[PDB]
Symmetry: C2
Subunit: 56 residues, 2 copies
């Protein structure tokens, strides 16, 4: 299902949409996306939006 992640970092801004199976898959997938492109921070999650964000 549709899960979204907002990469609100220093240099880069972003919004990614995926169709992962659940909160579990979407979560690890986004931990790895943010890590691979160099934004790491605290993760916020709204379950009304199915939207993760990571803020630096």
């Amino acid at each position: 299902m549709q899960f979204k992640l907002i990469l609100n970092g220093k240099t880069l801004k972003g919004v990614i949409t995926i169709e992962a199976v659940d909160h579990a898959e979407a979560e690890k997938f986004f931990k790895q996306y943010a890590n691979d492109n160099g934004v790491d921070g605290e993760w916020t999650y709204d379950e009304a939006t199915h939207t993760f964000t990571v803020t630096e």
Copy 2:
């Protein structure tokens, strides 16, 4: 499966194990647990242990 919650709060420390259906309902049980018992802070998640943390 057994999901865990590490409550790192100013005064209170805690560790809860529950048997919620998935990462989703465990995380919401832990969200409404955290406010219901009055800890507000930053959440990190370990997928090796099935273990949430909130550090106030």
